[PDB]
Design a protein around this ligand. Structure first.
Ligand SMILES: *C(=O)N1C[C@@H]2[C@H](C1)[C@@H]2c1ccn(-c2ccc(F)cc2)n1
Ligand SMILES: *C(=O)N1C[C@@H]2[C@H](C1)[C@H]2c1ccn(-c2ccc(F)cc2)n1
Lengths: 280, 283
């Protein structure tokens, strides 16, 4: 019924496309964060489509309108494999077009790992508060063994839900988040918590070989992805073209923050992609 | 006899200004053909002078900005004992004097600051002294991160006490630019004097205290392999400044003088400044 793709595990992934009227100048894959879905990138995608980019996305397995037990994954690499499947199909239909990646939170870790798996393949990456660092209190050998032990008996045990007020200072956007039926607001399950720790460990190992151009957007008051991880990404990535923008006092969901922040975010992505699309 | 530059040119033959201490500062102007859209002050680094910003200034003048500069006291064609200053604030006071004179002649125009190394610390302190006054600041490897006090009282018995001259190869990976640096007679290549090193430590301490009140928009350009201004200081400036509009660009493997680095770096530096100032000049 709906636009979709069938992944290597035989699971249906819901697909979304924002095709410009004329010939596309470039392709851009949108990778959403944990618990959310591709429908939340409607405004960003419309802005990008207005630059003559063909925007495409899928809801990651266990998210939005895609199949899978909610916010569970056999191995974090499944997300990367599925992005590469979708990118490869699009590129076959649009040969020679440059391909960009845009990712938020966990979607940002997926984008990093996707570009690290295919060096020199992506024209650029836009990262909005990417998941790159674990809280040191949750990554100790003791806490990892405790989580692994707990995983054996109660893999679906919830770590408790977050206070949705840490997502954005924009109260209306918090209320939109809280009433979207496609968002999973249930607490992080132990088994998925371990997969996010695998994602952070894999990101850290990938940075010395990451050469893709990137734009990194980060809020200074983000309680989910600490701003210190954005500074470490700027320092450790080997990319020759890297830009960081810090939004003072902003929370996690920068593209759904206070209008002053959101307008700047859209403008900065517009300018950065536009400058690297003319280059093609 | 008429007052002359340290290189014996009468100041009456050159654009100049006289600072609050009665010292002549050599001035430089790059005025666009038509009506200027904005003003931009260029603040040079320690040991160098305003003549090294010729190319950057021509690019900015091409955006219809009126570019202006002076050689800091004790530098280039200005007066004063070489690379010595009574207090670091003298540099800030003199920038404000020049900015205030230009603004009187061009009322209502937005004013930007562009600074490299010590010139960047001057730009930060200048904007911190006048909140909401400057439209923006472009910083190229600014000086933000650091018992020579014994040597300060030992600079009463040994005034010329210096730290070793730096290895010019550390400034840029571009060998031609290193050779240009080494043969410019207006550059002071002598090692950093202890009394001046203390003033640079005062600058860094004052920059740290100014950051919680710094709100000016800024663009920060920094090389990852800079041995003079460690890249760590650029990350700390991004974190501690209260500015709502702040952008950092890191040049992987680049040295200190980014605007005179390898062509791939220099071309990006010029382009990024062009785009950043242009977007804030349209306003
Ligand atoms: C920029 O204008 N610079 C002047 C030359 C290079 C950077 C060096 C410099 C600036 C500040 N300091 C300094 C030295 C020691 C110390 F403990 C603090 C500051 N050196
Ligand atoms: C992005 O999609 N992210 C950002 C980061 C995980 C997914 C989210 C995060 C950080 C900390 N926690 C968390 C969840 C539940 C809990 F009880 C305590 C911390 N989720």
């Amino acid at each position: 019924d709906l636009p979709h793709l069938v992944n290597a595990d035989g699971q249906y992934l819901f697909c979304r496309y924002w095709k410009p009227t004329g010939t596309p100048k470039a392709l851009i894959f949108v990778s959403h964060g944990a618990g959310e879905h591709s429908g939340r990138y409607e405004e960003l995608a419309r802005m990008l489509m207005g630059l003559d980019l063909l925007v495409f996305a899928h809801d990651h397995v266990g998210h939005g309108q895609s199949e899978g037990e909610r916010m569970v994954v056999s191995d974090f690499h499944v997300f990367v494999r599925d992005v590469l499947q979708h990118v490869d199909s699009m590129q076959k239909d649009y040969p020679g077009l440059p391909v960009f990646l845009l990712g938020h939170s966990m979607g940002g870790a997926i984008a990093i790992l996707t570009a690290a798996e295919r060096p020199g393949h992506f024209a650029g990456m836009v990262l909005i508060s990417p998941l790159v660092l674990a809280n040191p209190e949750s990554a100790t050998t003791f806490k990892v063994l405790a989580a692994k032990v707990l995983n054996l008996v109660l893999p679906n045990l919830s770590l408790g839900p977050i206070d949705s007020s840490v997502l954005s200072r924009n109260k209306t956007e918090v209320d939109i988040y809280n009433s979207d039926p496609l968002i999973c607001r249930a607490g992080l399950k132990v088994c998925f918590g371990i997969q996010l720790l695998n994602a952070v460990s894999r990101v850290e190992r990938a940075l010395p070989k990451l050469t893709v151009p990137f734009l990194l957007l980060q809020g200074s008051a983000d309680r989910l992805c600490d701003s210190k991880g954005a500074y470490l990404l700027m320092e450790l990535a080997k990319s020759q073209d890297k830009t960081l923008k810090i939004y003072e006092g902003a929370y996690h969901v920068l593209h759904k923050e206070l209008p002053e922040v959101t307008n700047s975010v859209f403008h900065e992505i517009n300018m950065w992609v536009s400058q690297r699309t003319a280059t093609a």
